[PDB]
Structure 1
Amino acid sequence: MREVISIHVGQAGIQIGNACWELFCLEHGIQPDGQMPDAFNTFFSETGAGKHVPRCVFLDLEPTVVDEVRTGTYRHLFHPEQLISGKEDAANNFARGHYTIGKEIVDLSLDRIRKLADNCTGLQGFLMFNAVGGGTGSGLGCLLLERLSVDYGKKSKLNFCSWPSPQVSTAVVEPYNSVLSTHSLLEHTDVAVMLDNEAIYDICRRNLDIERPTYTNLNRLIAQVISSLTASLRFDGALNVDVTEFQTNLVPYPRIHFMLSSYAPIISAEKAYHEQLSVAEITNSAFEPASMMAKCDPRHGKYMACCLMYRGDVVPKDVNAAVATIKTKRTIQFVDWCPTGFKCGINYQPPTVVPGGDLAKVMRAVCMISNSTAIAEVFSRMDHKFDLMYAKRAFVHWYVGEGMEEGEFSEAREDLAALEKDYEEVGI
């Protein structure tokens, strides 16, 4: 029947999918061998007498992580040809990942997603987990959108991008990779959201009250927000909307497809004790400006469209009551040309808890994707960082001698700048 295929470009993308697929194994109750002891059909195919295999492909150029997935405990969960690894790193180069050491691995990964797509009809789209500052996540990410858009021209794409964060960057040439990635990201993806790293870091610092987590603690949060987004595709709910409705309800112009995200609650074992997590409570907390997942304050911006996914024992009245109190609140500002800016889908099956992780067993939860005019300052600082770096050829000589001519840098400048003028003209 219906299925959706995930693609994982970059080390960050594969580690996001690593917490994703162990979470889906808990959700559908399958062991890491794939064999159970028909709601799983949108993520898992069939194999033999009871095995299931994910419709995922783990695409890097570095073998130190892809072969480490093969060697680890989740070996036979994945079909071994779905994990495609290269030879050598792009090494924070958009030039290497897109031109030189990409041509021998895009054609191989295209064959694997070809054989993964024709197995059944009823596909909704693709879910590409990738980072932005990395050379592989921007380089192979650009070429994969370029090839998938020209032949699958009517199918949706879900570019979950780990955008660079404001205070910390843990990279040097990553403003170069970010502007070059959006040069081709605008015309090739259908839905994209920004998941900045220190916005998530702040979330797990004052909701979990843990001050030195690791990468796996954030990837559990991204796994939880993908699982809460696609729970409508899997479990039956009173009001169910899925990937087709996202492509037509949250992106009112063809070129604005950048959204935020949040979750509520993100509570530990001790913090589940001392409050009941009412629907109105987990909507106010999700709408808190400090609760966003992109360091993207909506206090000095106007919301454009909003979407919330209620999961668990939610009742259809207080979804309307929490939305009503949000309308009455003056701190949250909407846009003039959208009087009815609220969409939601309610589901019955509550989010599972990983035993030994950091979440707590909650009766209900809220996923969030919200388009707003507040990403203008998110990309305007990528403009400012790129200005003083591209003054007098910082690290440009190894992008220009190794695959592209000088001028693609300038073309990426007005492509991101026209996105700023697009964000300005919508609000006014």
Structure 2
Amino acid sequence: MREIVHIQAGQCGNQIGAKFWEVISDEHGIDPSGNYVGDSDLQLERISVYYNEASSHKYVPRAILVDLEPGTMDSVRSGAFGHLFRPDNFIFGQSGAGNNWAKGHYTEGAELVDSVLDVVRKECENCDCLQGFQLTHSLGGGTGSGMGTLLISKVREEYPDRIMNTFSVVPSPKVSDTVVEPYNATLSIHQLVENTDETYCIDNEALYDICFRTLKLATPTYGDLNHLVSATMSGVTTSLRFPGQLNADLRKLAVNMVPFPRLHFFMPGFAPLTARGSQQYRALTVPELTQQMFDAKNMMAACDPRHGRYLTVATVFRGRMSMKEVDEQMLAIQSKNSSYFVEWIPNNVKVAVCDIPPRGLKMSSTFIGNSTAIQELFKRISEQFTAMFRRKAFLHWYTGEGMDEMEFTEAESNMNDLVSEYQQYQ
């Protein structure tokens, strides 16, 4: 019951996804080549959510690994824990898109799609009850942005009522690892608008900041950053994988957190973000966690929630707690500074409490916010697009792959509309 398909597209997705798999396997007591080292019946009970079980009690992720560039695939396999993945779920093209969204979306993506589709169908028919999909990818590159969205579209055509989740990394203004990010982001976000139920917006800059100032680390690697993301991912789905006191699946959160179909971009935050030298000077507790979760510093999306308003917030807590305590904390948060909580939605807080905490720490919280402040992120991107598009810069590459001016205009328009909608409700 309630079984999920994972998908990883492009470089970022593949690496983040790997990390996620490492984490969740660790949580459920699974070794890399080793079949089972779990300590508890509970872990065993819901292995079938994310895994399949071959002969002699082996276990294997319902995960699909996709990229137009062969190299990253090589890296993934070459890592320790690489033997756990079914070899038939490695589905890569021959030549990479090279940060050309159009290539991702037309020339190579189309050629790639069929194999992917077949594998997804196979995965579906294998299992009794299909819940949802989880895609990890970028909006800044050609493959993750272009092909990913195509894939999503295809999926939608097949199963209209199933859940679509995406964990999407986003562009930031000061740090651009590609000059054509405005275009790439724009095109892909349009596509997302129509086919996703919930989208988790994640910024690298924010992550870096967190690593530097909160965790007090001088040398953050990508892996470290990815760790947080992995943790967040784990947190979201804890309700499906463990018996709690109050349980909230993917669907539940979606229903709770989306007042209008269009506005389904969630800003995740996480607690507690402790440092190594600094942890022994804290009393581990509900209120502290709650206080941490609503700081602008712990928003993984680089937007200030001070300049917008929360429509809705979902709080998923792990470890034993007093539900009453949690509720009182929530109340305190709401009444004290209701300045950033929308009046027409009376109670803006959703709570889920799951009994099994992550490995390492005794109590933890994941915060998922639908904030009107997210419009700010889109605005900068829009501005950048405008700046580029007026001079027709770099349009020629996109033209060369089938694209035409009209599409760009339309996507931008859509984005603008979205922005306006967010503003209106603020």
Structure-1 separation of matches of 2:334 and 2:197: 29
Structure-1 separation of matches of 2:6 and 2:47: 14
How far 1:82 sits from its partner (Å)? Answer: 0.6
Question: What amino acid sits opposite 1:385 in the alignment?
Answer: Q
How far 1:386 sits from its partner (Å)? Answer: 0.9
Other-structure match for 2:216: 209
Name which of 77, 101, 104 aligns with 1:97.
104
Mapping of 1:154-173 within 5 angstroms?
A: 154-173=161-180
How far 1:54 sits from its partner (Å)? Answer: 0.3
Name which of 185, 191, 209 aligns with 2:192.
185
Other-structure match for 2:90: 83
Question: What amino acid sits opposite 1:139 in the alignment?
Answer: G
How far 1:75 sits from its partner (Å)? Answer: 3.0
How far 1:6 sits from its partner (Å)? Answer: 0.9
Q: Secondary structure at the match of 2:140?
A: coil
Name which of 238, 248, 251 aligns with 2:245.
238
Other-structure match for 1:119: 126
2:282 is aligned with 1:275: yes
2:149 is aligned with 1:138: no
Question: What amino acid sits opposite 2:100 in the alignment?
Answer: N
Work out whether residues 236 and 250 of structure 2, in 8 Å CA contact, stay in contact via their aligned partners in 1.
no
How far 1:276 sits from its partner (Å)? Answer: 1.2
Other-structure match for 2:421: 422
2:334 is aligned with 1:335: no
Deviations 1:87-128 (A, max 9, x none): 011000111001001112111111111111111122221011
How far 1:67 sits from its partner (Å)? Answer: 2.0
Name which of 43, 61, 68 aligns with 2:68.
61
Mapping of 1:345-360 within 5 angstroms?
A: 345-352=352-359
Task: Normalising by structure 1, report the TM-score.
Answer: 0.95
Deviates more, 1:297-306 or 1:270-279: 270-279
Question: What amino acid sits opposite 2:101 in the alignment?
Answer: F
Work out whether residues 5 and 50 of structure 2, in 8 Å CA contact, stay in contact via their aligned partners in 1.
yes
Task: Normalising by structure 2, report the TM-score.
Answer: 0.96
Structure-1 separation of matches of 2:339 and 2:212: 24
Work out whether residues 96 and 143 of structure 2, in 8 Å CA contact, stay in contact via their aligned partners in 1.
yes
Other-structure match for 2:408: 409
Structure-2 separation of matches of 1:336 and 1:209: 38
Other-structure match for 2:15: 15
Structure-2 separation of matches of 1:260 and 1:177: 21
Work out whether residues 136 and 166 of structure 2, in 8 Å CA contact, stay in contact via their aligned partners in 1.
yes
2:301 is aligned with 1:302: no
How far 1:260 sits from its partner (Å)? Answer: 0.4
Q: Secondary structure at the match of 1:140?
A: helix
Name which of 248, 251, 257 aligns with 1:250.
257
Q: Secondary structure at the match of 1:336?
A: coil
Structure-1 separation of matches of 2:394 and 2:386: 13
Q: Secondary structure at the match of 2:350?
A: strand
Structure-1 separation of matches of 2:413 and 2:121: 35
- State percent identity of aligned pairs: 43
How far 1:300 sits from its partner (Å)? Answer: 1.2
Describe the shift of the 1:293–1:394 C-alpha distance in structure 2 as closer, same or farther (beyond 3 A): same
Work out whether residues 15 and 76 of structure 2, in 8 Å CA contact, stay in contact via their aligned partners in 1.
no
Question: What amino acid sits opposite 2:153 in the alignment?
Answer: E
Q: Secondary structure at the match of 2:182?
A: helix
How far 1:166 sits from its partner (Å)? Answer: 3.0
Name which of 313, 338, 355 aligns with 2:320.
313
Question: What amino acid sits opposite 1:12 in the alignment?
Answer: C
Q: Secondary structure at the match of 2:183?
A: helix
Larger proportion of helix: 2
Deviations 1:237-278 (A, max 9, x none): 100110110221101111110110100111133222011121
Q: Secondary structure at the match of 1:366?
A: strand
Work out whether residues 183 and 412 of structure 1, in 8 Å CA contact, stay in contact via their aligned partners in 2.
yes
Other-structure match for 1:356: none
Name which of 202, 207, 226 aligns with 1:200.
207
2:225 is aligned with 1:226: no
Structure-2 separation of matches of 1:45 and 1:138: 29
Structure-1 separation of matches of 2:423 and 2:111: 41
Structure-2 separation of matches of 1:263 and 1:90: 33
Deviations 1:156-185 (A, max 9, x none): 101111011232121110111001111211
How far 1:232 sits from its partner (Å)? Answer: 1.0
Describe the shift of the 1:332–1:82 C-alpha distance in structure 2 as closer, same or farther (beyond 3 A): farther
Work out whether residues 263 and 367 of structure 1, in 8 Å CA contact, stay in contact via their aligned partners in 2.
yes
Other-structure match for 1:399: 398
Structure-2 separation of matches of 1:131 and 1:108: 21
> What's the Cα RMSD here?
1.2
Structure-2 separation of matches of 1:163 and 1:131: 7
Stretches of structure 2 that go unaligned for 5 or more consecutive residues are 38-44
Other-structure match for 1:47: 54
Q: Secondary structure at the match of 1:170?
A: coil
2:389 is aligned with 1:372: no
Other-structure match for 2:42: none
Work out whether residues 34 and 53 of structure 1, in 8 Å CA contact, stay in contact via their aligned partners in 2.
no
Q: Secondary structure at the match of 2:66?
A: strand
Structure-1 separation of matches of 2:338 and 2:293: 14
Other-structure match for 2:332: 325
Structure-2 separation of matches of 1:300 and 1:189: 26
2:183 is aligned with 1:176: yes
Q: Secondary structure at the match of 1:110?
A: helix
Describe the shift of the 1:313–1:166 C-alpha distance in structure 2 as closer, same or farther (beyond 3 A): farther
Work out whether residues 34 and 76 of structure 1, in 8 Å CA contact, stay in contact via their aligned partners in 2.
no
